[PDB]
RNA sequence: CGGUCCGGCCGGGAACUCAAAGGAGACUGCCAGUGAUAAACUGGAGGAAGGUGGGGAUGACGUCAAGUCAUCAUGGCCCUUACGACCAGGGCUACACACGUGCUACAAUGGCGCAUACAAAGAGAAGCGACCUCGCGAGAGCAAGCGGACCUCAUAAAGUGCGUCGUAGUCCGGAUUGGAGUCUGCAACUCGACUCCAUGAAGUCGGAAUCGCUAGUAAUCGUGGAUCAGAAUGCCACGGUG
């Protein structure tokens, strides 16, 4: 994991989106291509349409996830079935 | 192997006693080039079985080794699935080496206290014609007469 | 290599040399433990503000004559094939066939 | 003004001086009990001395460097052999018969390219 | 010896005796003995009840048996409740760190 | 006090350089300690000469660098005038150390 | 040889270990036997060396429409609002498997705790990095010296000394998994490694059929170096034992 000296790492443009979401009026999901930005308690409740490679997937943020990267809740490749699951 | 008739490389002078046969035995026993541990183990087994027997160390080792040195082995110079086996009388040069190889093979077959104790029992009983190396030699000798149609 | 790939190397190295003065004096604040977290966080976010290929880590080592990512020698500065050609033609001083 | 002989085995250099002093041995500011680990090295570094009567007849102030334990033992053996040969000029025949004058030129072979070792090759792919 | 709900034979040393306890291992097996005033050389035999209870209290100081086991099970289930990539890899059972799972990983999976 | 170090790729171009520097020092000064050699360095390189899939076609290249050292013979002012002359033939690196 | 801070410490000593340049030196030269009165072979007085002393480089005519038009160049063919040009996020590292080349091993030839020697070859300038102190730890502040026979990387391991483990779900194997960090990198979730605690998969010598090696070679132990911000169980070389 990252050293505690530098602390959490988030995108610069992400902070502006987070601030605008909490102040004021959150109705549309926050669209971010950044997945390496750590989750903060300010984002709790708000919808994050995180890009994974094809299309932004909605993630609902709760207090359980704080010290985990936002990209963890975003599968990279679609899995249905190895034995030709039709 | 085809045109060259090799000689023989000299063996270690065996600093403890001076027995080239003992040097050959310890060289066969040692593995992975770890001479120190193998020599220590063989010396400890050397002492234990000599003091268990009572006679002189080397004078008992020679009489225990000559009692399971084989005389005739069986080989097969045939090609294909079908094979014919022919008995061949071993030369004295290979006789001691084969006996030592059988001894060291049979040594690592008992779950004793240590490798020295594993060596000691099967080294001492060879004088009385007991153990595993003598057991396999008395069957190798029977293999020659099992089918001696061609020799 | 490709013309665009070769131009990428010079475009990255130019911006890495231009911003080298800011990068070192900005990461110095982060490295200095005897500092406030309020300035540490500001330094951390300000480093991601400049363009990405502005660091020595974001550039490759394609050979000067042709351009080849895989296969390179720092001392000679060329790929393996070009180095061999130069050695056989005599362009590299004091280079012969090693045999020991 | 005492002369001496030099000896090397694989990559180790040992030079041993000969003086009339009876049996004073110290191997590079050490002794046989210090530079030890197995009786084979101690026996092999005294074979020219143990040949006829020179076990406790002249001292051995050798200092040896390089190589391993066996390499240092061989270097010391060759050095004392050469020193005794230069000292006496009549033990050379006995040393040649014992095989001590002939320096062992065998050294480690270089690692070839494509092979895992000097001669060991990678296993063929089941073909 | 009934230490933290486990039984220990009398033919072993104290280090392995503590190691046999689920959640003590090797370093704690020496730290507990050092804290209780016992060298890591004695056996289970010839062990006074005072030393037994001191060792038991030292073991109870840190985490424990099946309590710690369900301790860990809840921590693992936290990932699945989160639903992150790590939780999904736990659900699949194949990796949790992300090694080469496609060619040869026969450690958490297996046939009948 | 002062020393001169010579680095060369080949000994042919450094033996003549040492001879020239010692004869210049003999013309201007005396009491030379002789050019002392130092352990040469051999930098190796393994180049697979095949431009495609063949990990059996390798070439071993070697760069040799030989070191010579010349110390003071007579520390004066005239002896430095004849040693601060123009550089020798290209291929010999000369380093001047003073203290 | 002198003194000592007992240390090459330095005065000093240029024989040695060694440094890197030139030579001598092994050339069937000789002595016997063998052979066709030869070529050549066998043994030996000498030598560090004996028939190429031991290794490396050196790879013919040519075969395989052998492999690369994605190192590069090059003849046509193809697009010029796109097969061309820029950027963000994912994939080359992937759910039921098979195959190939290596590593750990299987244990009492062994791992474990505390002393203790023996090497060579290489790297180092926005790089190697002494010492002190915090550290159970990867490391962190402090940093001197070093473009390097000077200073570092870097008390080599095997072994050797002593106990301890007694053939055992083992003090055997460290694969999996959870907790919290240390270094480099705008940023290790997809995707590096190191460090602690715990957990302790198999395995308990492997079927047909197979791979390399004839001497400092096969095995077994450790280290350096290439590209490299970091990433070897791979590659390329030194050595220890053998």
UniProtKB/Swiss-Prot annotation, chain B:
UniProt-recorded Gene Ontology molecular function terms: mRNA binding; rRNA binding; structural constituent of ribosome; tRNA binding
Q: Which superkingdom, per the lineage?
A: Bacteria
What role does it play? One of the primary rRNA binding proteins, it binds directly to 16S rRNA where it nucleates assembly of the head domain of the 30S subunit. Is located at the subunit interface close to the decoding center, where it has been shown to contact mRNA. Has been shown to contact tRNA in both the P and E sites; it probably blocks exit of the E site tRNA.
Something else known: The strain K12 sequence is shown. Has been predicted to contact the N-terminal domain of IF-3 based on footprint studies; exactly how IF-3 interacts with the 30S subunit is controversial.
The family annotation for this protein states:
Belongs to the universal ribosomal protein uS7 family.
Q: How does it assemble?
A: Part of the 30S ribosomal subunit. Contacts proteins S9 and S11. Cross-links to IF3 and the P and E site tRNAs.
> What name does UniProt use for this protein?
Small ribosomal subunit protein uS7
Q: Which gene encodes it?
A: rpsG
Residue window of the full protein shown: 2 to 152 of 179
Swiss-Prot record, chain C:
What domain of life does the native source organism fall in? Answer: Bacteria
PROSITE patterns in the cross-refs: RIBOSOMAL_S14
Q: Provide this UniProt record's keywords sorted from A to Z.
A: Ribonucleoprotein, Ribosomal protein
Q: Which GO terms describe its molecular function?
A: rRNA binding; structural constituent of ribosome; tRNA binding
Gene Ontology annotations for the cellular component aspect, listed alphabetically: cytoplasm; cytosolic small ribosomal subunit; small ribosomal subunit
> Using the chain's own numbering, where are the disulfide bonds?
none
Which BP terms does GO give this entry? cytoplasmic translation; ribosomal small subunit assembly; translation
Q: Which InterPro entries does UniProt cross-reference here?
A: Ribosomal_uS14, Ribosomal_uS14_bac/plastid, Ribosomal_uS14_CS
> What SUPFAM superfamilies does the record point to?
Glucocorticoid receptor-like (DNA-binding domain)
- What is said about its interaction partners and assembly? Part of the 30S ribosomal subunit. Contacts proteins S3 and S10.
Q: Which family does it belong to?
A: Belongs to the universal ribosomal protein uS14 family.
What does this chain do?
Binds 16S rRNA, required for the assembly of 30S particles and may also be responsible for determining the conformation of the 16S rRNA at the A site.
Question: Under what name is this protein listed?
Answer: Small ribosomal subunit protein uS14
Species whose genome carries this gene: Escherichia coli (strain K12)
Curated annotation (Swiss-Prot), chain E:
Provide the effect of residue 104 to K: In PW097; partially suppresses a rimM deletion
Give the GO terms filed under biological process for this record: cytoplasmic translation
Identify a single GO molecular function assigned to this protein: structural constituent of ribosome
Keyword Lipid metabolism found: no
Name the keywords, alphabetized: Ribonucleoprotein, Ribosomal protein, RNA-binding, rRNA-binding, tRNA-binding
Statement: the UniProt record of this protein carries the keyword Transport: no
Its Gene Ontology cellular component terms are: cytoplasm; cytosol; cytosolic small ribosomal subunit; small ribosomal subunit
Name the Gene3D superfamilies on file: 1.10.8.50, 30s ribosomal protein s13, domain 2 (4.10.910.10)
Top-level lineage group: Bacteria
Enumerate the InterPro entries for this protein. Rbsml_uS13_C, Ribosomal_uS13, Ribosomal_uS13-like_H2TH, Ribosomal_uS13_bac-type, Ribosomal_uS13_CS
Which family does the record claim for this protein? Belongs to the universal ribosomal protein uS13 family.
User: Its biological function?
Assistant: Located at the top of the head of the 30S subunit, it contacts several helices of the 16S rRNA.
- Assembly information from the UniProt record: Part of the 30S ribosomal subunit. Forms a loose heterodimer with protein S19. Cross-links to the P site tRNA and weakly to the A site tRNA. Forms two bridges to the 50S subunit in the 70S ribosome, contacting the 16S rRNA and proteins S19 and L5.
Give the protein name, as stated in the record.
Small ribosomal subunit protein uS13
- Gene symbol here is rpsM
UniProtKB/Swiss-Prot annotation, chain F:
Query: What SUPFAM superfamilies would the database entry show?
Result: Ribosomal protein S10
Extract one GO BP annotation from the record: transcription antitermination
The protein's matches in Pfam families, at most eight in alphabetical order, are given as: Ribosomal_S10 (PF00338)
Q: Which Gene3D superfamilies does the record associate with it?
A: Ribosomal protein S10 domain
Can you cite an annotated GO cellular component?
transcription elongation factor complex
Is the Ribosomal protein keyword given for this protein?
yes
HAMAP family, A to Z: Ribosomal_uS10
Among NCBIfam families, the record links this protein to: PRK00596.1 (NF001861), rpsJ_bact (TIGR01049)
This chain's function reads: Involved in the binding of tRNA to the ribosomes. Part of the processive rRNA transcription and antitermination complex (rrnTAC). The complex forms an RNA-chaperone ring around the RNA exit tunnel of RNA polymerase (RNAP). It supports rapid transcription and antitermination of rRNA operons, cotranscriptional rRNA folding, and annealing of distal rRNA regions to allow correct ribosome biogenesis. In complex with NusB is involved in the regulation of ribosomal RNA (rRNA) biosynthesis by transcriptional antitermination.
Q: How does it assemble?
A: Part of the 30S ribosomal subunit. Can also form a heterodimer with the transcription antitermination protein NusB. Binding of S10 to NusB is mutually exclusive with its incorporation into the ribosome. The rRNA transcription and antitermination complex (rrnTAC) consists of RNAP, NusA, NusB, NusE (this protein), NusG, SubB, ribosomal protein S4, DNA and precursor rRNA; S4 is more flexible than other subunits.
Q: How is this protein named in the record?
A: Small ribosomal subunit protein uS10
Q: Which organism is it from?
A: Escherichia coli (strain K12)
